[PDB]
Ligand binder design. Structure first.
Ligand SMILES: CC1(C)C(/C=C/C=C2\N(CCCO)c3ccccc3C2(C)C)=[N+](CCCO)c2ccccc21
Ligand SMILES: [Mg+2]
Ligand SMILES: [Mg+2]
Ligand SMILES: [Mg+2]
Ligand SMILES: [Mg+2]
Ligand SMILES: [Mg+2]
Length: 138
RNA sequence: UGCACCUGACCCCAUGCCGAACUCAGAGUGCA
């Protein structure tokens, strides 16, 4: 299955426990979902986004159609993130957390807005989660 | 302007109960 997911359970979760003193494993910050929005024919862009995420994009409308959105959870989230980190990005802004433990990245390369939503309640906990998963910050 | 977060339900719409979800709305946080 997914190496990044295995890295979470084997490496990241125990380090977070040591670092923050969570007394049960279900308290430890987890990835919840990754939402990708691509602003805007539409059929080609939807097919490319479908190919890269493995999931059917919804059409965001003002329609008039204005963008494409996909909410990735579970294995599709992990598989997409493994690609983003290992293939696409080859540092991220460490200040781009939303104040509630979620990370925001806007790309105008290879605009695409990515929200990494976590169960961390603080930016600090979320930053540690993502850094330990291998997100390149600084 | 958009997505995410946040907070709600006059309004289109919604729950085979629940504005949880879906829909919609809004001076604030993040990014583009
Ligand atoms: C270019 C874009 C998406 C952007 C655009 C604002 C666009 C408009 N705005 C501003 C907000 C209006 O509703 C207006 C206003 C009246 C008529 C037309 C417009 C348009 C041109 C659609 N904005 C908002 C500008 C910051 O306030 C950003 C910000 C960062 C990166 C990229 C952007
Ligand atoms: Mg959070
Ligand atoms: Mg009402
Ligand atoms: Mg809500
Ligand atoms: Mg439903
Ligand atoms: Mg809205």
């Amino acid at each position: 299955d997914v190496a990044l997911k295995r890295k979470y359970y084997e490496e990241v979760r125990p380090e977070l426990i040591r670092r923050f003193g969570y007394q049960n494993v279900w308290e430890v910050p987890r990835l919840e979902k990754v939402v990708i929005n691509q602003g805007l024919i539409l059929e080609k862009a939807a097919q490319e986004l479908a190919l890269i995420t493995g999931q059917k994009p919804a059409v965001t409308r003002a329609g008039m159609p204005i963008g494409l959105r996909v909410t990735l959870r579970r294995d599709r989230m992990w598989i997409f993130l493994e690609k983003l980190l290992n293939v696409a990005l080859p540092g991220l802004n460490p200040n781009s957390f939303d104040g509630r433990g979620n990370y925001n990245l806007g790309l105008r390369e290879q605009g695409m807005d990515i929200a990494v939503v976590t169960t961390a309640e603080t930016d600090e906990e979320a930053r540690a989660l993502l850094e330990l998963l291998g997100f390149p910050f600084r």
